[PDB]
Each structure stands twice: as C-alpha cells, then as structure tokens.
Design a protein around this nucleic acid. Structure first.
Lengths: 216, 171, 51, 144, 124
RNA sequence: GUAAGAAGUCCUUGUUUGAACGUGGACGAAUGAAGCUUUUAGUGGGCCAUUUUUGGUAAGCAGAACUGGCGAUGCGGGAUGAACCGAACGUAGAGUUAAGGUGCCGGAAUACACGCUCAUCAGACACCACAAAAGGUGUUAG
RNA sequence: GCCCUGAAAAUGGAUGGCGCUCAAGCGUGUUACCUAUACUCUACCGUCAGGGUUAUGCCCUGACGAGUAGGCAGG
C-alpha cells in the first residue's frame, strides 16, 4: 500500500518535471524569438513593437486614514487592504479605470518571471476555504486547482504570467502578498508624487521588479 | 538624475481609411524611458492631435555621443512660458557631451533664475564646429592659445579633528 | 509548524520543482546564445543619429 | 492597519448548547452530537438543532395533526417524530395504530395511542431503532 | 407622423416613454420620461405599461395605460438578441470558444515598415 | 432610466383573417464577498477643514450641497498646540521604513556637485495672502 | 534671480537656543544615514471562525486586538 502511494507520487513527480522543462523551453524560445524579430526589423529597416503588457503587479503605498470612499472601495475590491500588501491583476479597460482611480495610493508595474517566482516561493500563501494556508507542497495546489490542471506551483506561476483561462481562479486562490518595506529604502525622499516627479506611486513599468525584490 | 538622450517614435494608431500613419520622431533628454515617453506625448499633444490612448510608441532607443571624450562648445536654445508670452534664451556651454551640457544647464537655470524642470523647454543643443562662431565671453575666455592659470587657495580636506601643523594653502 | 523557504534550503527546493536538479546541471542561467551577425539598416542608423 | 470589511469577532449565534439544566436532555444532546457528527444523515442534525430550542419555539403537536400526517399517501407506517410535547385531542374519535416518538407525552395522549394499539417511545429508543432517521416523519407545531 | 400608428405592440415587448407635445391627450407622468416598461395588456386606443418605481429602498410595481403616440419601441435588447443568436450558431459550430464577451484587450506585437514613410523628426 | 439569459432561447395545435393559454421535444462583461422577525439604551439644531455654487464690499463674508476629521484618539514629526504631515494601539524581541530630518544642544554626512547672495540688527517654506505700487550708480544671467 | 528700502512704538527676548557667511542661508541634483504603538518574521495572552474526538472539556489550523455615552459576558 505504501508502494502504491510512492508509485502515485513518482508518476506525478515525473509529470511535474516534464511540464516544467516544457515551460522553460517555452519561455526561452519566446524571448529569443522576440529578440530576433526586433533584429530582423532593424536589418530590414522596419520597426518592431512588442505586445502590450497584459499582467501587472500592484502594491499599496498609503495607509488607511483619510482615504476617500471611492479609492477605499476600489482597494477593497483589489484586496489591497493594508500598506505594502500586493496583488497581480489582468489589465483591460475595466481594470485600467480602477488603476487610474487608485494611482495616488499604489505603485504598480509590469513584473518579471524572476520576481513572480520569488514571490510565489517565499511569500506564496494559498486559500483552502479560508485561512491563508502556506503552500509548502504541490499537493495543496493539486487538490484545489487540479480542477484546472494546475498540479504544481510552477504550473500556477505559468498560468499567472502567461495569462491563462483560469488566471482569475489561481489569483483568487493566491492570498494577497504581504510585503515588508524596502531594504535599500524607497530612493526618493517623498513618496506621494508620481514616479515621474521624483515620487514613488504610479506606473513605472519595469522597476517594480527592483522594488518588490527589495521589499520581499 | 544623470540624464540620457532617447530617440522616440510615435505612430498615431491606424484606422481603416488610414493604414501606416506618419511616424513622428523626437529626441528627449531624461533619466529613463518612462519620463522620456511622457515628455514625448506631452510635446506631441501640443504639436498634433494625438493621445496616449489614441496613439502608440514604436521604437524607444538610446543615443550615445559619437565622441564622448572630445571637448566641444555647445550652443543651446531654451524657452520657458514665463511670465509674459514665451521668450527665448541662447546659452553656451563648454563640455564633452550633450548630456553634461543639459545637466549643468538645468542646474544653472535653477540657480540663476529659480526656473524649474517643469518650466523649461529644450529646443536645440548644437555643437559649434568652427571657432569665431563662439559668441559668449565666458566661453571665449577658455579658447586662448596656451592657456594657463593657477589655483591659489588649496584648502586641504582633513580627515581628523586636530592638527599639529598650522596648515598651509600653497601651490 | 515552521515555514522553510526555497531559494535557500535546496532540500525543500527539490521537494518542489524537481526540474531544478537538471537546471543546475546544465546550469541554464549562464547559458550561451547562438551567435548571429544581423547588421542593421542605413536608414535605421541615420534616423537614430539625426534627421 | 487593515481597513476591515466584515465586523471582526462575530459570534454567529446559533445556540451551540441548550439553556436548560435537565441532565437527561443533556444526555440526549450528547448522543445526537455523536450521531450527527458520525452518521452523515441530515435527520440527526435537525433533531439536535431542535433540542436546543425554547418552550416558545417548541409548540405542542396534537394527535389530530399526527393523524393528518398519517392520512398522507405512502406515509401511514412511518415512525412519526415530535421533539417537543404531544397533547390529546377529543375532537377526533378514530386514531391509527402508529408508532410515535417524543420527549414528553401527556397521559391522555399516551392512553389514546396505547388504546389504538401503537406505542410511545423516547428519542434514544428512536436512535437505536432508526439512527439515520429511516422511515421517519418529523412534525412541528403551529408557531404563532 | 403616421408611422406612429402602424406599430403593433404585443404583451411582453419593452418600450420607452417619450411623450410628444403635438397631442394634448394623455400627456402622462411628468417624470415618466425616458423610462422603460414592458406592456402587460392592450386595448383599443391604448397600451399597458408597467414600471418598477422605487420608494424608500424597495422597487414597487406601477401599472399604467398610455396612448400609442407617446410610447416607442426600445432598442435595449438588440445586441442581446444578436449575441444570443450568434451564440447559438457558435455553439452549433463547436458541437460540429469564448462566446462570452471580453473587454478591450492589449494590442499584440506587430511590425511597422519604412517604405515611403520615413519618420519625420521635429520639435516645439 | 433600462438590459447584459436555464423565472432564457428553439420544434409540438385544442379556445377571439389571427392573438393569448396549454401539451410535450433540443440547448454566455470585469473585480471582490444570506434573509427573517423580536426588543431597548445613549444621541437626536456642535466644532474644525477642503471643493461645488448663489448673493456679496473698504476689507473681510453670509447662505445652502456633498466629503473628511475632532467630539470618543493614544503614537512619530512640526521647538510647544483637538482638528497640519505620516500612521491608528494586545504583551515582547530582531530587521526595514513613513512624515520630518543629519554643525552642537540631538540619534544621523561640518557628505559630493553646480551656481547665486554681504544685509548699520540678511535668511533659515512660500502664497502677484497684507504692508504693494514702485524705488536703488549693489550683483549675476538673459 | 538674490540684496537694501518698501514705516512700528513703548518691562529685557528670541529662525526653539547656541551660533552660522565658497554657510550650519537660497535653488537644484546624486548618494549614504537617523527614526514610530506603521510594514515583515517569530513567541506568548485573549477573542472569533473552521475542523477532529468514547467531554460548558482535549487536540489541530488560521485571521484578528483603538475606544467616550452605552450594551453584553465571565469573574
């Protein structure tokens, strides 16, 4: 009976390793092909534009006092209930209007696979009816989101970054990330201006990786 | 911060009726691509009828100086909508790069006029190839033959609190 | 009872993501790229440098 | 701070135990807590919820109401159940030979049932007869 | 406008109330203007219309009679019915998908050419 | 204001040239997470701030409409302060920060860089908020 | 742009004080640093919820903790 348990474990483990190798191949060939497309446009004298980002990561920057009701409600909706809490969101028009509303109180941007992996590994906590369960094992994900074929934490990272059919379900399973304040600091002396005016909030589009890597 | 020069191009978004629109280009001085693109749209809204939602950027690129060790005499056009209708300024800066010229220009404007980044507009930075096109006297000062000058007051930075020497500022 | 973190503790890292072993063997992050020589266009370098 | 949304530290109500001090009733709820926890039958959870109720919310149920329930189709031989109290009724003259289980019977109601032929039973005996509530018919009295 | 009389209105249809000034008879309902209600019964001279009017914080139901001159067919459900029929067709094709709606997505990668359109540099 | 579906769509013929009911067959934007009574405390024309708008004149200002806060509220900063900035509280430890700051008082660079300024009581947050409209052979850049 | 004047009385007096003049002042930029009952991690107390178990108890898990008038509960 224990041999049967170990056999099932070994089967699922081999499945995980082939899936993860496939995902690595996918990511490397995708980025390499984008690079070669840019180079081909340059050689032909044409210009190549990359696809607009579809995922963004958002971090709360302002406390709870003296927040107006509409951004307060929007932050409730996006589960940014406290300072430095954070979530992934899929960007469409409907979400861009929300981000426009909550720009003064959040810093958001376009995240990297490295920071997504680091977040989901170090601060990755899941919801099992409730409760913010730490992940700690691929079984906890294969139970809940095996309905959607996500048998592993890396499969979950893939469904997140490659925004998939079940991004909503995976992200809602993911508890809002609890982050610290950055170790190097925020840089700027005053936070509550835009990123452009020597502040911190608003969209910065690539340095959110640096910021969340300092904060995590 | 320490500025950089960025090439930017904008496409304003195609339609039926109008495929392949006219690709307006600009040169920007800025710390990073975000600020560069914001400034691009800021100038493009003034020049033409475009919008960040109504348009798109094609190719952000960097421009490095072709000879960043050759010393040069730059002439800069500047304007700033103050206090009257807008009025222009010509300044001359002896430096190695357009980036350094623009940085020291912004600092000099902030010092001598209390005029700010938000207030300032860069029209054209241009190297002056030939001498005798240099107009300003403070740049003419430094083009003379076999120029020499001393530094008569030397004051030495001291790492300690106390000294046993009655120090000297010589050269 | 205690949360142990991957990115340290290779044992709990390998509990998850068993691809990490061959990842570190082939090293797959110091990986070299196939070389090419696709030169750019005269129009490109022109419109970059000026006018 | 957290900026709460759900009025933290809610009590949920729902009467986890009875206000009574009857030790026998406490034996009954101690039994039905085990049954409702281990059986998976819903009948036992219903009975356990009903045991916590008050006198105002446990109205009496009449012999005539029981006879109405037994006049239903395919429901004559079911073991009828009233968690509360069962009263007599001199308005009905003919009564079935049914089985019935309840906490408290009145003397006249017990006599009527025994006379018709049936038996009067307690909830623990109902448990050792029909744990999951198989072939049972629960009744409740008019609240208002 | 005679086309406001060759207009069948069956029980179930949805109509907006927009009363025109040109007919003094049956000018209804000062604030029932640009408000939509389905028709419950019809007589001559007449059409029924029901509206959910809110008082306090509950929607009560007000039924009413109106002349045909003021009411108008609603184009409220045009895209709804079009999408339902297209969904039936797409479900048939699947049986042989994302028939659901989706907001505006981020535009994908592409290539911009320079054949006669060289980029035009300029300044303030 | 209304709508964004299984209380919805599509085949099946008895009752005013046809309508309604009825018979049976095939199948939907995003994000986030209950309802019903019963009953009674205290408060029920008080103070501050922002922005919308009507009327305003020596100047101020008076009326209404939201919103936020104090009242009930401690903590860090502003030398001190009910309503300013940050941030809301269980008891402890380690780390990182906010706002504000780093000559000494006072924990932290008498740090780096570019300029300007000498005031016979300079200045050390401003506000074409007041003195107010200018004057000056003081200085710098246009 | 900075500087002087651009009127204001009357106990002795305050950029908070000392005092500061290529500043310890004005403007701007680049870093490092100090630091809260705030954020992160851990333990402990209590409450709440969810589970398990022949015992208004025992065990597991998690999220939370401001407070006047005033209300409820345990002592």
């Amino acid at each position: 009976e224990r041999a049967a348990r170990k056999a099932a474990n070994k089967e699922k483990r081999a499945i995980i390793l082939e899936r993860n190798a496939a995902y690595q191949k996918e990511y490397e060939t995708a980025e390499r092909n984008i690079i070669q497309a840019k180079r081909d446009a340059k050689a032909a004298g044409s210009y190549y534009v990359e696809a607009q980002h579809k995922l963004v990561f958002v971090v709360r920057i302002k406390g709870i006092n003296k927040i107006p009701p509409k951004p307060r409600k929007v932050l409730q909706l996006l589960r940014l209930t406290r300072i430095n809490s954070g979530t992934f969101v899929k960007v469409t028009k409907a979400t861009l209007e929300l981000l426009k509303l909550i720009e003064p109180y959040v810093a958001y941007g376009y995240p990297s696979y490295s920071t997504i992996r680091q977040l989901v590994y170090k601060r990755g906590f899941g919801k099992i009816n409730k409760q913010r369960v730490p992940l700690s094992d691929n079984a906890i994900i294969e139970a809940n989101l095996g309905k959607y074929g996500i048998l592993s934490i890396d499969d979950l990272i893939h469904e997140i970054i490659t925004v998939g059919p079940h991004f909503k379900q995976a992200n809602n399973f993911l508890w809002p990330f609890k982050l610290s304040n950055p170790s190097g600091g925020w840089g700027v002396p005053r936070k509550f201006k835009h990123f452009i005016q020597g502040g911190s909030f608003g969209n910065r589009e690539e340095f959110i990786n640096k910021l969340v890597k300092s904060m995590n | 911060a320490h500025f950089k020069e960025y090439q930017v191009i904008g496409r304003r978004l195609p339609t039926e009726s109008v495929p392949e629109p006219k690709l307006f280009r600009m040169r920007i001085f800025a710390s990073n691509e975000v600020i560069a693109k914001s400034r691009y749209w800021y100038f493009l809204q003034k020049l033409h009828k475009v919008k960040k939602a109504s348009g798109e950027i094609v190719s952000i690129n960097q421009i490095n100086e072709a000879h960043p060790t050759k010393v040069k005499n730059f002439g800069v056009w500047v304007r700033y909508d103050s206090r009257s209708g807008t009025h222009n300024m010509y300044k001359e800066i002896r430096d190695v790069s357009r980036v350094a010229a623009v940085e020291t220009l912004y600092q000099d404007m902030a010092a001598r006029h209390r005029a700010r980044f938000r207030s300032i507009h860069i029209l054209k930075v241009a190297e002056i190839e030939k001498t005798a096109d240099v107009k300003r006297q403070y740049v003419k000062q430094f083009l003379t033959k076999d120029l020499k000058f001393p530094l008569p007051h030397r004051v030495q930075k001291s790492t300690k609190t106390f000294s046993y020497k009655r120090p000297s500022t010589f050269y | 009872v205690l949360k142990k973190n991957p990115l340290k503790n290779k044992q709990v890292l390998l509990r998850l993501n068993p691809y990490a072993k061959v990842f570190a063997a082939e090293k797959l992050g110091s990986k070299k790229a196939e070389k090419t020589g696709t030169k750019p266009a005269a129009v490109f370098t022109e419109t970059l440098k000026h006018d | 701070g957290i900026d709460h949304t759900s009025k933290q530290h809610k009590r949920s109500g729902h009467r986890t135990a009875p206000k009574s001090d009857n030790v026998y009733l406490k034996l009954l709820v101690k039994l039905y807590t085990f049954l409702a926890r281990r059986t998976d039958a819903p009948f036992n959870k219903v009975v356990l919820k009903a045991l916590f109720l008050s006198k105002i919310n446990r109205p009496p149920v009449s012999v005539s109401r029981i006879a109405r329930a037994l006049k239903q189709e395919g429901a004559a031989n079911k073991t009828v159940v009233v968690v509360g109290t069962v009263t007599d009724d001199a308005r009905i003259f003919e009564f079935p030979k049914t089985t019935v289980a309840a906490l408290r019977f009145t003397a006249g109601a017990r006599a009527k049932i025994v006379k018709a032929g049936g038996e009067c039973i307690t909830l623990d005996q109902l448990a050792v007869r029909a744990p999951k509530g198989q072939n049972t018919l629960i009744l409740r009295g008019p609240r208002n | 406008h005679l086309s406001t009389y060759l207009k069948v209105y069956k029980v179930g249809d949805i109509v907006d109330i927009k009363a025109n000034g040109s007919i003094q008879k049956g000018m209804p309902h000062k604030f029932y203007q640009g408000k939509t209600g389905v028709v419950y019964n019809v007589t001559k001279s007449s059409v029924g219309v029901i509206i959910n009017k809110m008082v306090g914080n509950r929607y009560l139901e007000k039924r009413l009679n109106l002349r045909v001159e003021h009411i108008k067919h609603s184009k409220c459900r045009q895209e709804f019915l079009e999408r339902v029929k297209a969904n039936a067709a797409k479900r048939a094709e699947a049986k042989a998908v994302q028939l659901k709606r989706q907001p505006a997505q981020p535009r994908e990668s592409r290539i911009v050419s320079t054949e006669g359109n060289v980029p035009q540099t300029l300044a303030p």
